[PDB]
Design a binder for this molecule. Structure first.
Ligand SMILES: Nc1ncnc2c1ncn2[C@@H]1O[C@H](COP(=O)(O)OP(=O)(O)O)[C@@H](O)[C@H]1O
Ligand code: ALF
Ligand SMILES: [Cl-]
Ligand SMILES: [Mg+2]
Length: 405
């Protein structure tokens, strides 16, 4: 961020600060299961208050409500409660993020006010699909809520969304989390230790399958696991995949990706066996399958099996550096957690013998919280997709939109 305004050089005295954060925290049974992302923003928030900010107005998305209000399902209200405990200051939660009422609440607040707005993605203008003059008006409304802007939303920095690139204030500064994460990656990605392994799992198949092409120019091995694998196996192996996650568009590039991996000498490790489920539920009936057997119709692969874990372990053993985004099964549910646990065990062991190990993402970092490995790997990032986009070698839109020095 040498070329960008950052918070250390932003005069906040008597200024209202409007701050984009990534508070897209994981939730199970209605409760926050990991406050990592909230804690991570506290240094920037406290710095603003300690240096005389009139207010700090915090804004984030939560999940993918796709531009419809879904307060029953994706409200940020529970955040606002957690943030109080972590800050040691109270926080006022607003039930919207624009409108005349939000604008009044933020126009002239009492000294030291911390305000959290409701989920930005309840409005289609944030993404904005899920409307050009309404996008302008949305961006204009957010811009009224502060005198200066800070973006600390590392985990969202890959998204050219209204709150991330569209705020129109004179000073647009990178926050301390943005800086810490970008600095860590700049150093780790400059001359990676090799073999450099990427582990790509998770559930955001449509988006993340599109990152593989450029990642194949940077890494020496790739594990393609979790929900990502089934698109590959359907195409390459003619495997029956049942109701497992599948991306029609990404299927069309699978063979080209494998051709490129071969051209670039990148070893691809796909799973060979699975724990299956009869529905997407923690208490689903379960089974087992191999690539050869296929997955029965109406069943989904929600974890890898033991032979896959062995192949993943082999790749981790060869690695001198690892970047991991996306669990290799639905680790939130114990029936489907073994593959991710086993991989975590391997990644911790790799770290202990000198491997540089980087785990990132809202959900993947929660694997570290669950199994108490946050201090047993080299770096746990609040960015997952954002970190993969750095790995590709791109400038992130949320960084690009900051003020130049
Ligand atoms: N085979 C699978 N089918 C469906 N979901 C999966 C599978 N494997 C992993 N997942 C899910 O992937 C989710 C996380 O993916 P993603 O959001 O892309 O990662 P991150 O949060 O680290 O950026 C987890 O909630 C996990 O349950
Ligand atoms: F769910 Al992510 F990076 F894609 F935290
Ligand atoms: Cl996606
Ligand atoms: Mg996630």
């Amino acid at each position: 961020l040498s070329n960008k305004l950052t918070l250390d050089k932003l005069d906040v005295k008597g200024k209202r600060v409007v701050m984009r954060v990534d508070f897209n925290v994981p939730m199970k049974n209605n409760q926050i299961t990991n406050n990592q992302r909230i804690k991570a923003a506290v240094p920037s928030i406290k710095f603003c208050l300690d240096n005389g900010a009139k207010s700090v107005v915090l804004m984030s998305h939560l999940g993918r409500p796709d531009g419809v209000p879904m307060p029953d399902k994706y409200s940020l209200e529970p955040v606002a409660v957690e943030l109080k405990s972590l800050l040691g200051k109270d926080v006022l939660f607003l039930k919207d993020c624009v409108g005349p009422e939000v604008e009044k609440a933020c126009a002239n607040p009492a000294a030291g006010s911390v305000i959290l707005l409701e989920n930005l993605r309840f409005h289609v203008e944030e993404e904005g699909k899920g409307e050009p003059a309404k996008i302008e008006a949305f961006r204009a409304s957010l811009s009224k809520l502060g005198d200066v802007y800070v973006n600390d939303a590392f985990g969202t920095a890959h998204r050219a969304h209204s709150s991330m690139v569209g705020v129109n204030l004179p000073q647009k500064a990178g926050g301390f989390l943005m800086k810490k994460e970008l600095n860590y990656f700049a150093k780790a990605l400059e001359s990676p230790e090799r073999p450099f392994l990427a582990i790509l799992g998770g559930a955001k198949v449509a988006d993340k399958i599109q990152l593989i092409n450029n990642m194949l120019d940077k890494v020496n091995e790739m594990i393609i696991g979790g929900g990502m694998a089934f698109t590959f196996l359907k195409v390459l192996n003619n495997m029956e995949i049942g109701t497992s996650l599948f991306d029609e568009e990404g299927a069309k590039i699978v063979k080209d990706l494998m051709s490129k991996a071969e051209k670039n000498g990148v070893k691809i490790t796909l799973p060979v066996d699975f724990v299956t489920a009869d529905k997407f539920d923690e208490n689903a009936k379960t089974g087992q399958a191999t690539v050869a057997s296929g997955i029965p119709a109406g069943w989904m692969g929600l974890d890898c099996g033991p032979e896959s874990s062995k192949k993943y372990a082999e790749a981790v053993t060869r690695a001198k550096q690892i970047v991991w985004n996306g669990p290799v099964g639905v680790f939130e549910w114990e029936a489907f957690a073994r593959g991710t646990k086993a991989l975590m065990d391997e990644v911790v062991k790799a770290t202990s013998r000198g491997c540089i190990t980087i785990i990132g993402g809202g959900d993947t970092a929660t694997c570290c919280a669950k199994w108490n490995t946050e201090d047993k790997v080299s770096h746990v990032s609040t960015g997952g997709g954002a970190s993969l986009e750095l790995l590709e070698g791109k400038v992130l839109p949320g960084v690009d939109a900051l003020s130049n020095i």
